Design a protein around this nucleic acid. Structure first.
Ligand code: ZN
Ligand code: ZN
Ligand code: ZN
Ligand code: ZN
Length: 118
DNA sequence: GCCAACGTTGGC
DNA sequence: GCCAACGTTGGC
């Protein structure tokens, strides 16, 4: 389950109080049953939750411990759009096999195992 | 514990 | 085929 980034112009904009979802909020005098965010606050690049860890080694992102961009990528968590697996690419045992990175979402790709199947 | 809100589905 | 409603997760 992804969480809003809290840093995009969408995230930092206040609730309009006039859209369909704001109108449902108790704070704006609604029943509070829809439980959805303001329609003007839809995060552009949602992030993995703080507690996300690699399926294989059980650790979180360690990309700050490495300098090079390839090394950093391998120590970062990547979530597969297809199999939903969150893993460090360096924790995978597929040599040359490359996935397909999604640039619209952070830590998002179609993993090397799925691209090969597909 | 409070509260915001993601992802999915049955009922229309 | 849509969407209100809900269970339940995530940040604080
Ligand atoms: Zn709104
Ligand atoms: Zn955002
Ligand atoms: Zn790992
Ligand atoms: Zn996959």
């Amino acid at each position: 389950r992804r969480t809003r980034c809290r840093r995009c112009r969408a995230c930092v904009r206040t609730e309009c109080g006039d859209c369909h979802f704001c109108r449902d909020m108790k704070k704006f005098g609604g029943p509070g049953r829809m439980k959805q965010s303001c329609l003007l606050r839809q995060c552009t690049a949602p992030v993995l939750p703080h507690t996300a860890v690699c399926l294989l080694c059980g650790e979180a992102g360690k990309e700050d411990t490495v300098e090079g961009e390839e090394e950093k990528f391998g120590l970062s968590l990547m979530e597969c759009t297809i199999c939903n697996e969150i893993v460090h690419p360096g924790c995978l045992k597929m040599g040359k096999a490359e996935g397909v990175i999604n640039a619209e979402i952070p830590n998002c790709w179609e993993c090397p195992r799925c691209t090969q199947e597909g």
